[PDB]
Amino acid sequence: RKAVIKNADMSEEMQQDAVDCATQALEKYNIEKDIAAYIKKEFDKKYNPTWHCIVGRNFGSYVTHETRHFIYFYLGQVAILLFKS
Amino acid sequence: RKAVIKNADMSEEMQQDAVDCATQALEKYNIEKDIAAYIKKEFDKKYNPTWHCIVGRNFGSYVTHETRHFIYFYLGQVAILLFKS
């Protein structure tokens, strides 16, 4: 799975954490919603609430995110949006 | 064209508005990001910030929404997620 960061307002290692977490999610689950759930819940845990996650191959978004807490990246064949409101 | 509401934590009126607003978006724009933008800005305009919108044919989500401010629906062959944090 190739990781490609598209848009990030977020620290280097927090970004790395998003990738690592997303990797674990893709290994366990195949359904986008469940994958999205995994990532969201782990970021709530490690970095405090409240995070939202979108995982898919085809979508556009327009969201307002708290600063230093936004990432949008591809991991293999899916795109992942993760952010604090 | 064909509206189908999948999950809604939102009044019946504001639901019907979300449909009407998304219909306007699809009439004006073709790109999902622009459609989502249109919907998000309009709902920020008429019902106060902060809204977030996702428009797509293939995605899953897991988000934390405000009570009475969450909807997820199809309109023609596109799915739409709209919510306040």
């Binding site: 979508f59 556009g60 969201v63 708290e66 936004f70 591809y74 | 933008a37």
Partner: peptide, 11 residues
């Protein structure tokens, strides 16, 4: 401090 941004994918 909040910021607003759009994303688009089709892959």
């Amino acid at each position: 401090y909040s910021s607003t941004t759009g994303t688009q994918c089709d892959i």
